Design an enzyme around this catalytic site. Sequence first.
Site, short mmCIF file in Angstrom:
data_model
loop_
_atom_site.label_atom_id
_atom_site.label_comp_id
_atom_site.label_asym_id
_atom_site.label_seq_id
_atom_site.Cartn_x
_atom_site.Cartn_y
_atom_site.Cartn_z
N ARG A 38 0.87 -1.12 0.02
CA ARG A 38 0.02 -0.02 -0.06
C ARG A 38 0.78 1.27 -0.04
O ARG A 38 0.36 2.23 -0.57
CB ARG A 38 -0.82 0.01 1.14
N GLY A 373 -5.89 -5.21 2.36
CA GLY A 373 -4.70 -5.10 3.07
C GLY A 373 -4.05 -6.61 3.43
O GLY A 373 -2.86 -6.69 3.13
N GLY A 396 -12.43 -4.03 1.30
CA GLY A 396 -13.73 -3.58 1.37
C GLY A 396 -14.13 -2.35 0.12
O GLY A 396 -15.17 -2.29 -0.34
N1 LIG Z 1 -11.69 -17.78 10.90
C1 LIG Z 1 -10.98 -16.53 11.14
N2 LIG Z 1 -11.28 -16.11 12.34
C2 LIG Z 1 -10.56 -14.84 12.63
N3 LIG Z 1 -9.80 -14.14 11.67
C3 LIG Z 1 -9.81 -14.58 10.42
C4 LIG Z 1 -10.44 -15.75 10.03
N4 LIG Z 1 -10.13 -16.12 8.65
C5 LIG Z 1 -9.20 -15.14 8.41
N5 LIG Z 1 -9.12 -14.16 9.37
C6 LIG Z 1 -8.52 -12.86 9.31
O1 LIG Z 1 -9.21 -12.02 8.52
C7 LIG Z 1 -7.96 -10.86 8.36
C8 LIG Z 1 -8.16 -9.98 7.15
O2 LIG Z 1 -9.80 -9.59 6.91
P1 LIG Z 1 -9.61 -8.18 6.23
O3 LIG Z 1 -11.46 -8.03 6.22
O4 LIG Z 1 -9.08 -7.22 7.16
O5 LIG Z 1 -9.45 -8.49 4.94
P2 LIG Z 1 -8.52 -7.28 4.09
O6 LIG Z 1 -7.84 -8.04 3.05
O7 LIG Z 1 -7.43 -6.54 4.95
O8 LIG Z 1 -9.75 -6.33 3.70
P3 LIG Z 1 -9.52 -4.54 3.91
O9 LIG Z 1 -8.44 -4.03 2.83
O10 LIG Z 1 -10.94 -4.35 3.67
O11 LIG Z 1 -8.96 -4.27 5.21
C9 LIG Z 1 -6.59 -11.80 8.57
O12 LIG Z 1 -5.86 -11.01 9.45
C10 LIG Z 1 -7.08 -12.90 8.73
O13 LIG Z 1 -6.25 -13.52 9.96
NA NA Z 2 -7.47 -5.88 7.10
#
Ligand SMILES: Nc1ncnc2c1ncn2[C@@H]1O[C@H](COP(=O)(O)OP(=O)(O)OP(=O)(O)O)[C@@H](O)[C@H]1O
Ligand code: NA
Length: 416
Positions: A38, A373, A396
Amino acid sequence: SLSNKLTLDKLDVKGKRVVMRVDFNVPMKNNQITNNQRIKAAVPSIKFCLDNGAKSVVLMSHLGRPDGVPMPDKYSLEPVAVELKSLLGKDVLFLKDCVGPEVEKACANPAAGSVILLENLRFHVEEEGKGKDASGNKVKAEPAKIEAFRASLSKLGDVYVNDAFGTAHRAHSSMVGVNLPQKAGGFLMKKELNYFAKALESPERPFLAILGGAKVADKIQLINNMLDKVNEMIIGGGMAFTFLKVLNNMEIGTSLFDEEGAKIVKDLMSKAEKNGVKITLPVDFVTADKFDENAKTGQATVASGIPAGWMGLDCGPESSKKYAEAVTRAKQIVWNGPVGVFEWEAFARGTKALMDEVVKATSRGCITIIGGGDTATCCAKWNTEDKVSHVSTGGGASLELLEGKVLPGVDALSNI
Ligand SMILES: Nc1ncnc2c1ncn2[C@@H]1O[C@H](COP(=O)(O)OP(=O)(O)OP(=O)(O)O)[C@@H](O)[C@H]1O
Ligand code: NA
């Protein structure tokens, strides 16, 4: 999309102070940056400003979700200042706040070519307009203080650039509230919006959305509109347990659960049936006795349930097979949210296996888009950034584009 909007290539910056919102909300592990995606993505806009004679570039971002309380011990942007140095080839001045007379003085008349990074915007409740106090009680921000917050940020530059694609779905103060006469979209904003505009105009079909991750409260509320656009959805990661508890009466232990979203699960499934959208949920899991890299682990199925006190942190092998079947049918994929806690090796197998399948799909012509991210960090970790069609800095934000919305951070830019 930006067709109607002022963009940086048309913004005269010579002798101007540029205040720039960027998305520097980078993943952190053992207090190190695990993926500078990023940050690197904003370099073109920053370099353009400096090369075309900007007096200064003041960079502003959030990091994590500190909910309006200063937590520099834990969510400081200072490590990003260090990393940006290397990527720019220019030094960066890091300020320990983002508003107030001391910040305003440091940005009022800088040496020519100065790059300034402010501290985390969300250490102030006025960025999001709401948050928590240091005791954890929810709090709202006060309109007059939100105005004062926006007024302070507006003094830090003469012209404004928003290059924060990853945050563009957030109508936060630094994204929609800066009051300067010229408010321009940056080059990353343009690159991402242009990519999605074409990929979403007439998707290849079947069009699969893969929704995982841990931002369940937020992202469960996007499914309704996405069900009008896609032909299949994988609902995995932390998102799945709300669905399984409601639909299957599954015991989910301490797994992530959204009380509000649970109330719309059956309506979402009814709409998916009405629109012919095949929903793929996991059927088995890797479990953990606590939220820790070194937790004890177990296996579980939907039929067995998850033991009390345990949480599902990855899918299991039968889920990976079902996920793979959906990827094989797809001709276009948008994927946000890992399907397990891939940062910890005990809980990474399901995300790695799905990555393998998405890479293979790309190789036979599937249009594959991975964003977010943390989800983009999967691509960095397993070295697949060049093996999918597009790795987006928006997670998101990309899902809200899939819904068909105009993003608030785009809408707030100046019209041509
Ligand atoms: N079963 C689970 N329980 C808890 N956390 C989880 C599980 N599966 C995945 N994750 C977590 O989800 C996180 C990512 O979710 P997030 O929605 O923040 O995705 P992102 O790609 O960063 O999206 P954005 O760019 O919108 O933040 C990771 O840190 C991962 O550890
Ligand atoms: Na995230």
